[model samples]
Target: MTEYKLVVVGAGGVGKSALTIQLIQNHFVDEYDPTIEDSYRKQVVIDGETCLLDILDTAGQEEYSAMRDQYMRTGEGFLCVFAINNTKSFEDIHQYREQIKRVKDSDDVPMVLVGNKCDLAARTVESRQAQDLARSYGIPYIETSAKTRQGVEDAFYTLVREIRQH
Candidate 1:
């Protein structure tokens, strides 16, 4: 019953659940419909260890802030999400980082700052800036597109590998 916890966090409509669904189901839909609240589960192996990956896709609002903080404290890692076309989502990464810091004392935990929606890079507002911020924070950055399934699992697997290595 060993498990690894991860939080997919960002502003609303940034595609956190899209990446989560694509990772778990291995299928992508052209359009997405947001549900009120729920937790998604997936299983994967890392370094000969079987781990249950619990992904919490929280509502992008202040009301969920306390619950998000609770999970962030207990989470083994995080995949913080931002949309390549949204500067607001990119700016929100700082607040997510601050929340993680308030909940967990460890700077050593594996964190992946994800700039999502790479399919819309032609109008990108946050890709390069987000990557630079991730570098400053010492976490890895990956640009993802749930539509193309590009860099989708790379986001999860990279963090998993880092966790196992650590």
Candidate 2:
């Protein structure tokens, strides 16, 4: 019955906006679309409780740099995302986590690690690598595919729970 802002942050073309759009619109976009930041409001059931989620998705492109810190500072929970097929994106997760920690001024903030594009067969970032990084940060790692509708909601709902618990 409460409201919270959920942030999806990560490196470029990691399906951050794709996951956001899929959650809000119930469809997947295959083509690349670079956005500065988009906010979506939705009523969803998390743990059988009604929750109005404010999902904010940011552009991983450098041109949208202006919008990153503002949302990072304001959002309640972060769903740090990266593509499983991209090593650079996976490597960039640490920077995103550190950035959130820095802006929030809290080492232990509400966050969930997301490995996007799990449906792909040509993956550069494997499961154990992402798992170990998640374990290092003491956060849950969720494998998701916006295209196939796998673990998309799970990632967001877990982020909600993380925010609530903290």
Candidate 3:
């Protein structure tokens, strides 16, 4: 078994940290203050193999956009998450893609574009547009909910499995 850094990168409050936490520990955090007081990190055992999943969740607030590139540069793998209920977060995915391309080791480094908060679809903001955008990037995507534990592990596992295959 080998360990890999599975960085969860996306706009703030997109549940990057929370999704990683739940994937590794099967836990959920009701309220995560955007104050940066909460430490972001997680681990996972995939296909009976354990990995030290490093999650680097950046603040999506406009003030932190300048710092996004650095965070994306160091990821071995990434899960770019967007909340189904937030259009701003969804729109931010394109910027996230640019960062990934800048840091990608090769044109082939695998990535998973995740649409989070699937459980809140009723209040979704531009769901179809999000899908269209992801499609344009030529990557697979899944809508998941950290709260309901829906499609969370599926997203991460799918990405890792695809990576190992390469």
Q: Which tens-of-lDDT digit does each residue in 112-137 have in candidate 3?
A: 88998888845566657766776776
Rank candidates, lDDT, best first: 2, 1, 3
lDDT of 2 by residue, 50-163 (tens): 889999888798887686897779888999999999999999998998889988999979999999999999899989999999999999999999999899989998999999
By TM-score, who's the top model here? 2
For candidate 1, lDDT tens digit of each residue in 127-164?
Answer: 56776888898888998998889999899888777666
The regions of model 3 sitting more than 4 angstroms off are: 35-44, 48-52, 62-68, 125-128
Error of 3 at 7 (Å): 1.6
Write the number of the candidate with greater TM-score, choosing between 1 and 3: 1
Off by over 4 Å in 1: 29-37, 63-66
RMSD of each: 2.2, 0.9, 2.9
Clashes of each: 0, 0, 1
The local distance difference test score of each candidate is: 0.78, 0.91, 0.72
Q: What TM-score number comes out for model 1?
A: 0.86
List the candidates' TM-scores in order. Answer: 0.86, 0.97, 0.79
